Design a protein around this motif. Structure first.
Motif, PDB file in Angstrom:
ATOM      1  N   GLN A  17      22.787  83.245 -36.699  1.00  0.00           N
ATOM      2  CA  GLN A  17      21.524  83.349 -37.384  1.00  0.00           C
ATOM      3  C   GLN A  17      20.275  83.502 -36.300  1.00  0.00           C
ATOM      4  OE1 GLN A  17      21.123  84.307 -40.587  1.00  0.00           O
ATOM      5  NE2 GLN A  17      23.077  84.126 -40.796  1.00  0.00           N
ATOM      6  N   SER A  19      17.305  81.101 -38.208  1.00  0.00           N
ATOM      7  CA  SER A  19      17.079  81.056 -39.476  1.00  0.00           C
ATOM      8  C   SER A  19      17.305  79.903 -40.389  1.00  0.00           C
ATOM      9  CB  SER A  19      18.100  82.549 -40.132  1.00  0.00           C
ATOM     10  OG  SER A  19      17.918  83.558 -39.199  1.00  0.00           O
ATOM     11  N   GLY A  20      16.490  79.055 -40.278  1.00  0.00           N
ATOM     12  CA  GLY A  20      16.597  77.901 -40.943  1.00  0.00           C
ATOM     13  C   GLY A  20      17.055  76.896 -39.929  1.00  0.00           C
ATOM     14  N   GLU A  80      17.753  79.082 -43.768  1.00  0.00           N
ATOM     15  CA  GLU A  80      17.347  80.666 -43.628  1.00  0.00           C
ATOM     16  C   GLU A  80      16.097  80.826 -44.286  1.00  0.00           C
ATOM     17  OE1 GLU A  80      21.404  81.541 -46.013  1.00  0.00           O
ATOM     18  OE2 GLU A  80      21.359  83.332 -44.678  1.00  0.00           O
ATOM     19  N   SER A  81      15.855  81.316 -45.170  1.00  0.00           N
ATOM     20  CA  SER A  81      14.672  81.715 -45.839  1.00  0.00           C
ATOM     21  C   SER A  81      13.865  80.556 -46.829  1.00  0.00           C
ATOM     22  CB  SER A  81      14.336  82.820 -46.505  1.00  0.00           C
ATOM     23  OG  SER A  81      14.926  84.032 -45.807  1.00  0.00           O
ATOM     24  N   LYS A  82      14.878  79.563 -46.991  1.00  0.00           N
ATOM     25  CA  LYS A  82      14.641  78.455 -48.026  1.00  0.00           C
ATOM     26  C   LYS A  82      13.834  77.269 -47.080  1.00  0.00           C
ATOM     27  CE  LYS A  82      18.935  79.085 -50.233  1.00  0.00           C
ATOM     28  NZ  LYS A  82      20.358  78.322 -50.359  1.00  0.00           N
ATOM     29  N   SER A 128      10.986  77.644 -45.211  1.00  0.00           N
ATOM     30  CA  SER A 128       9.667  77.939 -45.390  1.00  0.00           C
ATOM     31  C   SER A 128       9.261  77.945 -43.857  1.00  0.00           C
ATOM     32  CB  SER A 128       8.948  76.818 -46.244  1.00  0.00           C
ATOM     33  OG  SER A 128       7.540  77.011 -46.265  1.00  0.00           O
ATOM     34  N   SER A 176      11.040  77.785 -41.370  1.00  0.00           N
ATOM     35  CA  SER A 176      12.028  78.511 -40.745  1.00  0.00           C
ATOM     36  C   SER A 176      11.575  79.941 -40.261  1.00  0.00           C
ATOM     37  CB  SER A 176      13.322  78.566 -41.696  1.00  0.00           C
ATOM     38  OG  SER A 176      13.467  77.350 -41.977  1.00  0.00           O
ATOM     39  N   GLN A 200      11.995  83.408 -38.884  1.00  0.00           N
ATOM     40  CA  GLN A 200      13.209  84.044 -38.329  1.00  0.00           C
ATOM     41  C   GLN A 200      12.886  85.098 -37.224  1.00  0.00           C
ATOM     42  OE1 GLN A 200      13.962  85.815 -42.279  1.00  0.00           O
ATOM     43  NE2 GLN A 200      15.482  84.168 -42.864  1.00  0.00           N
TER      44      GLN A 200
END
Length: 23
Positions: free
Chosen positions: A2, A5-6, A14-16, A18, A20, A22
């Motif tokens: 990733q 990502s996170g 990852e996207s959870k 906030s 984070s 990317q």
């Protein structure tokens, strides 16, 4: 893997993450 990502303070949220942003 990733593109941070996170990985920003989180732990592969990852996207959870906030906060984070990317790449």
């Amino acid at each position: 893997g990733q593109h941070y990502s996170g990985q920003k303070g989180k732990q592969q949220t990852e996207s959870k993450g906030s906060f984070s942003i990317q790449y």
